[PDB]
Amino acid sequence: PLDGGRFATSDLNDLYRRVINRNNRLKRLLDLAAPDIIVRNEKRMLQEAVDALLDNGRRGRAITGSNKRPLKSLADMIKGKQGRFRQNLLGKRVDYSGRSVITVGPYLRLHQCGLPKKMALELFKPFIYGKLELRGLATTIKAAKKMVEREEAVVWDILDEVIREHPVLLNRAPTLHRLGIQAFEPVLIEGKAIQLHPLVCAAYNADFDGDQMAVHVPLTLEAQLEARALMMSTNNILSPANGEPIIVPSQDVVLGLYYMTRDCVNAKGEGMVLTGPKEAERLYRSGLASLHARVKVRITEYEKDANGELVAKTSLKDTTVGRAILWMIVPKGLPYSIVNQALGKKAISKMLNTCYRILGLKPTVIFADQIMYTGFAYAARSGASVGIDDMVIPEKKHEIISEAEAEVAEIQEQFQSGLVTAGERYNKVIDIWAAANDRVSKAMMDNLQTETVIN
Amino acid sequence: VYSYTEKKRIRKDFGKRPQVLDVPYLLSIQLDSFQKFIEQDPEGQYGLEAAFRSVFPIQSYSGNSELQYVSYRLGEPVFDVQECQIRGVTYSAPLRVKLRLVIYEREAPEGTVKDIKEQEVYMGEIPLMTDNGTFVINGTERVIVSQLHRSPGVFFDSDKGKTHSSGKVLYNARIIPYRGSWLDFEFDPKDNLFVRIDRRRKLPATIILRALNYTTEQILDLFFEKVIFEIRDNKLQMELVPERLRGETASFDIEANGKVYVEKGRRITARHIRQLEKDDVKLIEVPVEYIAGKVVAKDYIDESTGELICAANMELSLDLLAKLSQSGHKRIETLFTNDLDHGPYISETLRVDPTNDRLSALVEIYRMMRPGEPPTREAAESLFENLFFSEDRYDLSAVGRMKFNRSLLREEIEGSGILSKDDIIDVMKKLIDIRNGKGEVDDIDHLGNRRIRSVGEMAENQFRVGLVRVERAVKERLSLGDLDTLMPQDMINAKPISAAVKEFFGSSQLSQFMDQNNPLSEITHKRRISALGPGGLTRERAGFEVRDVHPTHYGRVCPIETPEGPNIGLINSLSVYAQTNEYGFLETPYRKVTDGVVTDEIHYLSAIEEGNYVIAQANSNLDEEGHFVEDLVTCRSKGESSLFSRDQVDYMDVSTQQVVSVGASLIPFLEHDDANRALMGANMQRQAVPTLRADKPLVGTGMERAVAVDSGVTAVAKRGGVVQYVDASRIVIKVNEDEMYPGEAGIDIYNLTKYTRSNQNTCINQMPCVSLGEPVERGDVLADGPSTDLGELALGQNMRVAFMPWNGYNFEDSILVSERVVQEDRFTTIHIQELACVSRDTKLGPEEITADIPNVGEAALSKLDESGIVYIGAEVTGGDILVGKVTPKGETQLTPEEKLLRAIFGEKASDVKDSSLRVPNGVSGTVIDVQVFTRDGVEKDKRALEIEEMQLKQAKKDLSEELQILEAGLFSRIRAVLVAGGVEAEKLDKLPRDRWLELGLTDEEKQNQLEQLAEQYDELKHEFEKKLEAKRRKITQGDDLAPGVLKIVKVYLAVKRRIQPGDKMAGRHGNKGVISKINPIEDMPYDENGTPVDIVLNPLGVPSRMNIGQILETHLGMAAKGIGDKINAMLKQQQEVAKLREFIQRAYDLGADVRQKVDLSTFSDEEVMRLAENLRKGMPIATPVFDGAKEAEIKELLKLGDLPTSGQIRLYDGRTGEQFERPVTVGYMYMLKLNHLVDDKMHARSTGSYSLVTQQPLGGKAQFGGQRFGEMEVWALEAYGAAYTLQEMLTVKSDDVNGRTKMYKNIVDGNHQMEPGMPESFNVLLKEIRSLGINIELEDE
């Protein structure tokens, strides 16, 4: 039915009607002894009508309706991307699902996503009915419904009770590779944005400029056991495309670590000796030494011995205050040399990989979380920022460009004297411009990259 | 000098380049084309008159009677625009046409008339464009996008062998009419020439050539060049042009002047050609092999027998040569085949043709075009003739004629719209020349080749369709019956015309729904250009080459503004200065160069002419004499940039900004940032939402004034004067004495659109921005609109921004916001939603609106009146009833045992059920307006009668207040005329105003003026009473509504929405960001003076996106407010105004060689104080797009502001109280809210409705459906071993009509069992496959 009491007829009904009509006409022309050519015309029309019914548009001009569109025959209900096979048999719409705009949450552990309270209430409303009747607070489904729609805070207590171990699935369209769907143990936040852990967000190929994400809740207990054992993000550390880890930091985390490990030739408190990394942290936080200052520190490390024991060693090493601070979080078993250099993205990647090979899964997970926290905090304290004076323009550039244009004029006038073909003139001009551009780039990099300071 | 109004907030320009041409009226194309469509025209060139004359008159032969057209006129639109928008009726006016019917006598001459009848036909209703350039269709605003399509004419095109792939090149030339069949001509890998009609088939070209009245020998004589040979006994002569020798190899000795000389086996070169030319050779003697291998040009006859031995296109058979030579026909004619210059292609076509004669080709063409029917000579002839040469079935419009001739280099510019024989043969010759290589194919993507078709052309096309349908109806009426006893009023049916025009305006792909987020968005949508639509192009078939930029886009189409995604390239925006040539080609202004001095005259060019000349780059520096400083001035010409001397330059760009549209032009510092990010920012700027309170942007572009005034939202001073009165909603202005027309009241009034639903649910509000007694000037802005302040565009807001990573809350473009922003309602926005309630005559009695609702608490009903309508002003929340409506449920018979079961249960199982309208879930707000519309003959309820009473009272008070104001103006004019002389001011003062108007102070023209205004007063009171009577009948009259509805009720709900984490905000340079945290104001970083930062952005995005310009913007912001802060303090200390005056003069002088040059010495001190009051909040800075502020000027401005010269400052972290070691960039930035609020997207469904056929859950937020587990996600699950969750996803959660019930039961019971049945969609598939006639069934049950 339609508004105003009208009805939308499915095109199949119209095709059926037409075929019925033609059949009735042919039978009437037969039973009243029509002439030959008339019944031949009627039966040819009937055959054409059957062709339209099954596969309209398969031959000749397609049938069309008042909208001047071709009617969808039975065959069109199975062919094509709108067909029954692709649309419904695969790719079903599903109950117990929601969608929301995502958002960074840095305070989350690795395996827990921040889920808005309203969505949680809506999704788990059946479970809430169940537990509310089970605990005897509500007697009938009507009572449960009216209670939950009034949000009597006891419903909020029940809701906090239900989800405590109940993993949910997060999905980002398009699900390019299987990492696109992952399992998380929810945490309840007021607001309306789903909060992710940035590390896995890097794996999602997602960003935060307004990307939406969909959440599904498993129903059965076998299903949630599967979600926990297989899909939980604490398991998907290694990509399937290659052995290297997928959980790798980027942006502020890497910037913070890089700043934390970079040393300078002269800084506050250079050359002093620290009896332990804790004292390095103290001297930094008390403000008597800057992170970049180089210092000797007593440090203990461990190695997996031939038997499998973490045999200890302790020694004095030259390092930086920042490097000692970072080392303090490193779990037992990794060698100190891993830290004692300017840490880039690739260095952190290989550090995570070597952690995962040397030690088990869980120390690597804890190491990842600690890395994320410390990197963010020290990046914030760093206060790195970009200013217009930073993009220094190498003053050589004007000279180099004048040289290049002089050569361009020279080759152009050489062509003006007819000494060369135009194509080779073009080639020469292109070559000299490329050479000049490379020279300018080298000058810019040389001027920017290094600077002089007093010792 | 500045107008007095503009003295408020004189924005500081920085542009160095002067401006020689003001930006044109931005909407001009739409308004002027529609005017051209509707306005009267005696010449019948365009619009209604042209359309009518293109069909009329109409003549009947057996009827011996004629229908002919006198004139057309457009009636009055019965409803005003706001009434149309309120009541939902299309804004239209009646089309009236004067028509005459003629009958002649039944004797020669047929022209002897005997009777004439004339009357006016109401042949249709037509929409009118509103003053803002938008149409009003039903209840909606709609604006027609001007299309850009391939021009009619002829084009020449080649593919780089892609089709055949052997490496050759193939050519085709195509002719496109304005309407009618296409023709295209094509070569072949076998070098045959083929012709095709509407791309039907592929046929040799000779078919048409003989279909045209030409025989084979005529064809050869026309297309090819002929050579003559003579035979005498067995000696052979040929007649030669020496140049004809060029190209061949002299394998045999060749004779001239009686001497024979050839280097055998060698190619004839220019020395040989010159030798023969100086020899002046005419006829030479050649061997038999030379004439061998030559084609027979024509038939040859032997008179000794009356026999023919030579045919057309035949090779030279030596036997035939001997026979004809002995017969006596010693002369022979042959063609010439230069392997490069004179390809034998036509001859090969003549060989391969199946046809033999004109009628054979005609019937073959007919059977090609009309398969499945027996050919007939008349049928084929009629088909061909009417197809190409019936000026009504086919027509190259005049633009088609111009392009056709100009591509064929013919002198003529005009001609008949139908083709001809010479046209076809000429285009074929041109294609042959192209195949020879003495030419070049055409470039269709070139902008001198595509054409802009505006609304007028589409409107007249649809109206012509209506006219031809009506013409068929009229000729049918003429044929069917008598001619005397009827009037053409009945002969013409308006039905087809109205159907066609309404179908165009409602349905058509180019009649797209308008967007109204902000005035800029409305402007850019009106101006937008689309390549799609009727006769256009499809997103699937659009290759890269049409999308890509073409070098003649410069100055005509903005390259930046294109939308992103699959539509890219196919949608564009007019550049700011571009205007349409009468032929629809784009046109750009330029400045004439005259011997090194720019004349400053303006000339308009199209892509062809621009390509022909040399035009200088805009940024070229000049002296005051007009001579360029540099001799080697850089310029562009013929699609390439280079350097040229001062004298070679022909034209100069008008202004720097002429390459970009308005949308890009608004962005400051555009010259400093990448194109991708600039594009994204330009597009995003359209989506901005108007805030609760407008704010100026500090770093603007000057364009804001023009855009704000040109859009329709702001009320502009149409007549200068002094503002007499202002309130929240009305403006009354006294027109000055000189400006007012004689007999006018001298007072004008404006009424502001106080609150209404925008087309995207945003608010639309107009706020006055003047005060009593302030002078106002022609073109001043009296009332601001949405996102407008003092007549400047005010999309965004000014925020204090620090660039610094902060604890990951700004990770990956995330934005962190200080709570102070929320507390000040800086980004709070007002939204309006409209809800409709429809009452219908349901089964077992109507469904009625009422407050008598079953099974509901009375407290909710108390919010409603006794009629069942909420009182305006009541707050309402999700799930509550706004209006009560009730549906009968039919009989609902209960057996007596069920009757007693119901009785013990209660009042349940009622035959009457609630249907009342309910608040959408999660929405809450306040109820601002209620509307009712009801069918005639039904009683008006309490709510209906009360609102009708209030509305009629409103109309009465409005009309009476208009009367009072205008009569006060009239009597003020009485005073002004009477004081002029012969005064009796006190003697009149004792008398009441009626005496003043009645009495005569003199006997002269003054008394004539008094009598004139008294008659004016009588006329205005009579028109006022007539207007109020019409208004009252118009209010009291019922409405048509729709079928079956008794009455509709609409209620208006308004909601205030607030910035919240998950909301998306973005800055003009295109750096989107989701707000991810609000912060207690204490925690935000704060500078040395203790004022906190407001918004913290991640810096890491800047180098990788290359949005360097935005950083510069930030710096300028820190400078701008700097001055503001200082001047604010300088005001707060309440010092002498002269000191701040000199300071302001310094601040304006600060620029170097800036065009501004404003001086305060002419300003009186109260004006200076007003200026300071507006400048207290910062000094707005104007930076043109490509002549913007330089870094040196920025530094100087900062230095005058006492801020750090680098723009970086020290900063303290509030959360610990320590100091960041690095300096940080803190400044001011302009930010927008992007209308993607989180509460519009968050959605969740536990369970709900289910679809009918597939039994799957519904889709979409509105239906409260669930998300779609697409096939990619299914593959993702398959990649894991997670079988069980997949099975649960498919069977139980989605499609099992019983399994999900079992699951719901077990979950409620607390048992997480599962039972997978069968997906019902599988049974659906089985039934459809079986219905197809294919047996499919399960096995092993």
Add this chain to the structure above:
Amino acid sequence: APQQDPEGNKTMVRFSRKTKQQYVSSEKDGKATGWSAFYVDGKWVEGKK
């Protein structure tokens, strides 16, 4: 049922065999005007045939 059509022609009563129901239609010069009105759930609805 509506006695006259929108053109002011006069109306006649006809049987729609395909839906077993009465309807009203108008004629001019004895030919059908191509206008019809039907009864659908206690209301009369009208339009082109």
Add this chain to the structure above:
Amino acid sequence: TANFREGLNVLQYFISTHGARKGLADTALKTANSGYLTRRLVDVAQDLVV
């Protein structure tokens, strides 16, 4: 010749836009082909299980 810090003239900017719209159209088209290819590969290899 001018870098991003100094202003680009209108000519440099205009010629630069070519690459920008080329890249945007490039990615717009590439997405569809990539998705289609993935659908194919999945269909061919979906039977194989250890």
Add this chain to the structure above:
Amino acid sequence: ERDGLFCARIFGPVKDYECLCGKYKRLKHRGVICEKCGVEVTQTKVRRERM
């Protein structure tokens, strides 16, 4: 309409255990045919099935 594209006598009742003639209204006669018409006292699900 009987013998039509939606003829209830063929495809079964539009409503659960409701005869087109109104002869029977409840499950007490579940699984019987009407005498005035060939519709069957059954569930609406049969409408989905029968061809």
Add this chain to the structure above:
DNA sequence: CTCTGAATCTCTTCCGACGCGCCGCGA
């Protein structure tokens, strides 16, 4: 000089992500 097979040419058919959101219209 003719017949058959193979090769080439012509004509017809199939395919060119996934996901959400609003608006209009609808014999």
Add this chain to the structure above:
RNA sequence: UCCGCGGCGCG
């Protein structure tokens, strides 16, 4: 409680 078609819009 609903089959869409067209259109913009964001991923």
Add this chain to the structure above:
DNA sequence: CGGAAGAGATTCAGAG
């Protein structure tokens, strides 16, 4: 539209 693949029809070369 364009590109690629398949099927049918027509033409050329080799062998008899």
